[PDB]
Amino acid sequence: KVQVLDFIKINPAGNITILIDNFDIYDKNIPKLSEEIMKETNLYAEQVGFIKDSHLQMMGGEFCGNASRAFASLLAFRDKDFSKQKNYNITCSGESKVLDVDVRNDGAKNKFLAKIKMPKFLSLEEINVDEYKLGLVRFSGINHFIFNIKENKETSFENIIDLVKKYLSNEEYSAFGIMFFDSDNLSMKPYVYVKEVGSGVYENSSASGTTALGYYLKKCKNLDRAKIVQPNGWLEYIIENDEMYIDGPVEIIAEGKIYIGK
Amino acid sequence: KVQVLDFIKINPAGNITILIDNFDIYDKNIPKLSEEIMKETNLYAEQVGFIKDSHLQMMGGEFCGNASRAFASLLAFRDKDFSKQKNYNITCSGESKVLDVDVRNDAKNKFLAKIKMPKFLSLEEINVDEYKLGLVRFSGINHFIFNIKENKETSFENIIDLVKKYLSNEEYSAFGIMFFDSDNLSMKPYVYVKEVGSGVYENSSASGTTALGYYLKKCKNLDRAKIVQPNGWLEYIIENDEMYIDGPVEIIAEGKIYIG
């Protein structure tokens, strides 16, 4: 049997997102479904969501700032009343608060700029393990470590990953991120690890990571706003009225039907 | 039936230690016995350790720099070859490495004992809520550092409830909070054990004094300082990438104790 699903492919700052539509968000087939979708042998993406009215049910039931930005940019794309700017109220899995996204046109009708209010950090640390100084911005769900390659000495990105892993060996964590940060170019190579899957992936973008880097830059350099270049995209962290926002580009790539093997 | 044990009550920097001599260090009743000895209705102590030939076995198999300092000062007290200084190589539970203690005279029952202390795993500076806390993490304990003067007005209990919140997601056996006064270079060591669900403001803490020493080496580049504690004082000394604790030890009493 062949399953046909409405899809929208989107590039939110490089974190490619497939947004399935007109589907049951509670379907237990969501995880395996999104798994086959994301393959390079299929509609290749880095995140998969499931739209319904104004709610975004991610594949993992978690909150994603980029997939939420992609979603809000779809409403504008599909809203006949949208002109050049509009605020779109949306809800997202893993976030009880209603998210008000400021969606602006970025030139074309498929290009957008989406500013979303990102969760607040629980704590901000500066750990000194081994011979390296590392940042840490603990969140509800993700621990985001920072690594100023410049301030630190020579090392493989792998070494800093095994060092952070050994650091959390006594800490019940489900996933951590490490932001290998270059201060000369304000660039950042986000990395993420998960225990359940037991692997690591270098991502093209990271809304939450950019938030972490922003928190660590406001404490260490008093930068309230800046654009963070990332592998295949860029984001901008914004601290206004003691609150964190992420702004960045969003491009509607494709629209149509996908054929999955049940 | 009543147990008769030989005891030496000592005052290591205020961390009252009863050392029980001529006893099976492998006895499984040691826990209960120590519990009963430490009561204020009995001999009274903050730590209890049992002694074989140059070996010191804590009640909980832990390492205690102060109790080990007391043990070394006892050997000097009972050694007629001891003068203004002698080095005694002792061992302590929870620490395989042999420990060279520099025991000196301070009276015949007053001493000064310098012992090498465990190395830290990582040093940090958390910024949770609106507080800046230091955190030195050792093997088995995590010593927080709360600079009262550099932080804002707060209750001690507040910082305790806060630190607990920080470790909610972390698996730990116990944590100490070194409430630090930068002006007088004094601190009020506190210690919580989730394994026993209770907190105690100690008269002194050796491990805590190393934590603050590590924290003061990174922040102010201080190698050695005297840290006054509620009822005692210890001196941390960092030399050649090693941590030491010096301080006063007084032999209080010798004799026999009776336990049922």
Author numbering:
A (entry chain B): 4 to 265
B (entry chain A): 4 to 109, 111 to 264
Paper quotes:
In this work, we set out to find the physiological substrate of the cofactor-independent racemase (predicted DapF, FN1732) from F. nucleatum ATCC 25586, and were surprised to find that this enzyme functions as a histidine racemase (HisR). The rate of HisR was not affected by buffer composition (PO4 or Tris), ions (SO42−, Mg2+, and EDTA), or the PLP inhibitor hydroxylamine; however, the enzyme activity was hindered by iodoacetamide and Hg2+, which are known inhibitors of enzymes with catalytic thiols. The DapF-like fold is an overall α+β structure, in which the monomer unit is composed of two structurally equivalent N-terminal and C-terminal domains.
In the asymmetric unit of C67S, there are two back-to-back dimers, while the asymmetric unit of C209S has one dimer and two monomers. Structures of C67S and C209S HisR were very similar, with a backbone r.m.s.d. of 0.493 Å by aligning α-carbons of 260 residues, and each adopt a DapF-like fold. In each structure, a sulfate (mutant C67S) or a phosphate (mutant C209S) is found in the active site directly between catalytic residues. Catalytic residues 67 and 209 reside at the N-terminal ends of central α-helices 2 and 4, allowing for stabilization of the negative charge formed on cysteine thiolates by helix dipoles during the reaction. The position of the loops above the active site spanning from residues 42 to 49 (N-terminal domain) and 197 to 206 (C-terminal domain) in HisR more closely match the conformation of the open C. glutamicum structure than the substrate-bound, closed form. CntK and other enzymes with a DapF-like fold are typically functional as homodimers, and HisR appears to maintain this feature.
